Design a protein around this ligand. Structure first.
Ligand code: FAD
Ligand code: FAD
Ligand code: LDP
Ligand code: LDP
Ligand code: ZN
Ligand code: ZN
Lengths: 230, 230
């Protein structure tokens, strides 16, 4: 049995280091015989804002608009904007979801943050109760492939930016694990802009290389100890 | 000599708890004689996406688009889109910047992440020469006023969501502190949707009561130790 992979990509320039990491993922997974799909957010001019335009049906409460309540209800009724449902179908069938993006303020670019806000709604990605290990997307794997401006050294406990794992918390635990995803070790390609030609090729080669045996990997213990140690 | 306050508000509903917190801040700071300005992102339909449209005229390299460089260059060349510059002016004149928003996936809603991504560009909020304690916005104060779905109990080091200080790291340290901001202790209104009307009032009152002496408050030590340590 093969596998389906969804790459949610967030970069404006195809020739970027991110674009290369993305194309590398596509080529390698495609070579393995895997089914691959890419959601190129910027090329899709993907809507990041969570507004009442995401609901098409009669609102549960037209007097006071509550995004969470309205999208939860719209999901069950099937009155969500189609751009949201198109993404949910991709995630639903996916066995692995890779996020390829440059770090923006210790997080994901707003266009990708919007994807997370609008696509992972209650009813589809999780339920109350029905989160974390009970998240609705349980059984699926997720992986963050991040590029940075800061060097590995800066991203250390005693470094100026602190350990890289610190900023992964909101994404891996607060979002992915919350929805039931098993999180694979993140792929951080440190400061490609500062790196030399050979170092950049090595970073890219390491990515595709790791992808060759990605199906053999085990997820990380997405806990506070893993991220912070303490 | 009077103070200037900018409130970056991120909520779709005026009758919301977030809306009330913002209105209470405007009322209290206005009563004190403070100069107050509010950036209602949703009402402004603020653009969250970082694209080449953020640069006016012609790009310094229309071959390969590098947002960071193009915006840095555009800033120094006074060629940024007006929505961006309108915000920077409010920021530059402000003595205190309050962010009022509901917690979305352990972070800010995408529309607000976009504000941070696009408004705090290189040359304005920071530069290789000066960052963090030497950020270009040094001297100014920043304060996060966030509302959550989860309860205070859930937000403890041994709780399901972990300690709230954990998700503050990317925002307070990675973003605000990085730009020279002195960070005031966050204002977190835990689960207002769960709490009772009396408890909700208590929360809003603590906020307004706190605003009475915010100018007397001392900045928190934005350190890895403060967020993660004991
Ligand atoms: C709003 C904003 C916020 C930011 N916040 C943060 C933050 O909080 N923390 C942080 O650390 N950084 C931050 N950054 C910096 C950001 O993370 C980096 O600029 C980004 O990750 C670099 O990745 P890239 O793909 O854009 O690089 P590129 O500039 O595209 O790549 C660098 C070089 O790679 C070359 N290249 C491309 N493909 C290949 C290939 N296959 N082989 C060899 N070379 C190749 C390119 O041609 C180029 O010369 C921020 C940037 C912005 C704009
Ligand atoms: C996409 C998305 C992602 C999310 N991610 C997270 C997450 O990672 N972690 C987390 O903990 N939560 C998360 N949440 C939940 C979110 O943080 C809460 O729903 C939100 O903070 C509630 O604030 P509110 O202003 O919307 O509440 P409201 O529903 O507007 O307020 C609750 C009650 O307050 C009443 N009220 C209004 N004004 C007043 C007043 N002046 N005095 C007294 N009562 C008043 C209202 O009328 C209402 O009945 C997420 C929600 C969404 C939609
Ligand atoms: N319908 C939004 C309610 C909600 C509460 C907690 C979360 O972690 C989350 O992603 C969403
Ligand atoms: N010119 C972007 C480089 C950069 C590096 C680290 C940051 O924290 C940041 O905001 C921006
Ligand atoms: Zn976790
Ligand atoms: Zn700090």
């Amino acid at each position: 049995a093969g596998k389906k992979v969804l790459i949610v990509y967030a970069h404006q320039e195809p020739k970027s280091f991110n674009g290369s990491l993305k194309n590398v993922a596509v080529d390698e997974l495609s070579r393995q015989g895997c089914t691959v799909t890419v959601s190129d957010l910027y090329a899709m001019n993907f809507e990041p804002r969570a507004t009442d335009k995401d609901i098409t049906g009669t609102l549960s409460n037209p007097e006071v608009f509550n995004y969470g309540v309205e999208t939860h209800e719209a999901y069950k009724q099937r009155s969500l904007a189609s751009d949201i449902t198109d993404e949910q179908k991709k995630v639903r069938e996916a066995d692995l979801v890779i996020f390829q993006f440059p770090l923006y303020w210790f997080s994901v670019p707003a266009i990708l943050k919007g994807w997370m806000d609008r696509v992972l709604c209650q009813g589809f990605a999780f339920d109350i109760p029905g989160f974390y290990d009970s998240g609705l997307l349980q059984g699926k794997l997720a992986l963050l492939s991040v590029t940075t401006g800061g060097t590995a050294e800066m991203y250390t406990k005693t470094g100026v930016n602190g350990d890289s794992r610190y900023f992964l918390w909101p994404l891996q635990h607060g979002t992915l694990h919350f929805c039931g995803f098993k999180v694979l070790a993140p792929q951080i390609s440190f400061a490609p802009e500062i790196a030399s030609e050979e170092e950049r090729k090595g970073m890219v080669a390491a990515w595709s290389q790791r992808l060759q045996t990605i199906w053999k990997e085990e997820p990380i213990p997405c806990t506070a100890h893993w991220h912070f140690g303490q």
